[PDB]
Design a protein around this nucleic acid. Structure first.
Lengths: 129, 129, 129, 129, 129, 129
RNA sequence: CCACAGUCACUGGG
RNA sequence: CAGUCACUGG
RNA sequence: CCACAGUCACUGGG
RNA sequence: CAGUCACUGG
């Protein structure tokens, strides 16, 4: 294998797609970013460690830029107003087989499938009701 | 409407599908569970709070169980051999429009699409390289 | 370029091959792990450091597990009945050229070549006689 | 029968071969030494012992010398400018069968096979990258 | 791709060229060295860290050795008579686009072009006047 | 000689070139700047001193303006968001001949040649991977 | 941070 | 030196 | 806040 | 853990 390759983060249907590509590997922490100023980029980082004797833990972080009214290549302050941060921590017991792990991934995919509660709430600046 | 509906967390092609349903909203934490005993159930929770004066934070949790039947005191009980824990926090600035948020949902969806790096590594019990 | 890739640790023909893959590279310690349950996986770690003003030191560690299924209370878990632990330390002075190093590697390879005393002894639960 | 015989430690084709031969076997420590000046010879030692009730432990040591001629006061002496020191410890539980051991040996051989990460790194005065 | 490749540090027209290659990435410090003994090698290291909330800093180091053969204890050893140390730190604001950065690379390249003031002074063991 | 002359810092191929010219010599510290407001200029400074008994040290500093979305002649704040700083310190042992120094310069040129790792990483808002 | 020093991913000084 | 071994104990 | 830990809307550590 | 390493020191 060798999974550290570029990929499509935001699929806008061929036209207007956001691709992120390998940008760093310092400390086993893999990083991908879109072709932008780091202040306006789409960043993705991932790493794995054995958190305890019983578990392994994947830490995945994603940064998404606020695009509405954005000024490409510009200095936008304050940073906190122009960026969204996603922090994911996946804990998997050392007994999990590959199939067990496939199931876990499926569950994650299902959690965010278009039309489901969570993605629907987020995409609508809403909570659950 | 109401976005607090049931949905399928794990899609196995209509046969062996893990569907999860609304089970609680106490203390502002929306909860869903699979049609199982509370000891062997898949659990999904979600909550939104206004973290800072200018941020909103979504806390989503998913628990994937490895179902098993244990024999305690000569008696057989439905239990979970172990559980996988997904913990994700999403911080979005209040200046994010709905389109801005759809961008975030698409990114999260892209992040886990079959074939991409992260889901590949996870399903293979490996890191990125 | 990268030497932190997956490789075949155990060459059992072209089928029962044990392949080990990059898992984590934190704190100067490269770690490879075979696929499936971490609990039953092969592990390989490696690191180099300047042990003294004149010497560089390598520390390689390998774990060979004896795969087994543990059952307790009627619950089956993939585990390792036990593990064989290989721990080696290689010290090389900074005056060693690439040729000198190639020589060192050859000696290591020869020491373990099929037919030779040490490997023969080990493979037969034996010592020297 | 005897496995305490001479063998080729360094296979440099069929000429510049470094052969090491039995030298002494006192106190459970088998020792091999290449021919000529002891001062410039290759050394290999090996021993097994029951380290615990459950484990047997092997201790292999190898010395690769950098041949050189020292001159002092006009007196020439064959010496070793410096020496590379390999020290390995292999622990194997008493439940290991001959098959289990053969497997362990294969893993050791694979770890050092030409082309693989560890040997490549060592042979190039390099680490992992 | 992967930008961690070998390159020629000193171009002497294909004959007497000093080429340097990846040798380590431990602790997030990318390292390259020339095909020499660690004691006589050319060394290049590079690292990026997010210095401030809005800055990123590249730390690049280059070590140019003056190779020599010293006689210590009547024995001859490959050593370095002395070393020249280049230490450079580049701080770039996160608002810099890729074009902004290309500008920086072009400037650094221009700074050292044959004929220009700085490289002229350095090569002549003189200051600017 | 007399190397304190104007030169092309950024070579954009005849059209759109950035030239810097002598602007100060206070304290032996030579300075060049582009024809801009000092807040938006390209600045280059260089100086030499004998740092110790064994070494001489060249301190070279370069400042590059962020051009994307820049407003020529305008007041851009905060300064830190609009500027990149390069700090170079070159240490050369007093034994270095002119030829030794030419080699050092070549190594610097090679380090930053178009297409090589470092310049490629910088120009792409990336690290090494 | 330093036109601070060194034997330089380390050490020492402002 | 010992251990289910980048960790612990002598 | 943490590529902090867990038995995980709870507990413990920076 | 370190060392010209079945030995020594932490």
């Amino acid at each position: 294998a060798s999974n550290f390759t570029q990929f499509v983060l935001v699929d806008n249907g061929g036209t207007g797609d956001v691709t992120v590509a390998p940008s760093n590997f310092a400390n086993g922490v893999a990083e991908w970013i879109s072709s932008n100023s780091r202040s306006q980029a789409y960043k993705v980082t991932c790493s794995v460690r054995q958190s305890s004797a019983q578990n392994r833990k994947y830490t995945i972080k994603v940064e998404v830029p606020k695009v509405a009214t954005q000024t490409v290549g510009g200095v936008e302050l304050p940073v906190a107003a122009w960026r969204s941060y996603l922090n994911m921590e996946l804990t998997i017991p050392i007994f999990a087989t590959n199939s067990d792990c496939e199931l876990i991934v499926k569950a994650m995919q299902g959690l965010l499938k278009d039309g489901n509660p969570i993605p629907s709430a987020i995409a609508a600046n809403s909570g659950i009701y």
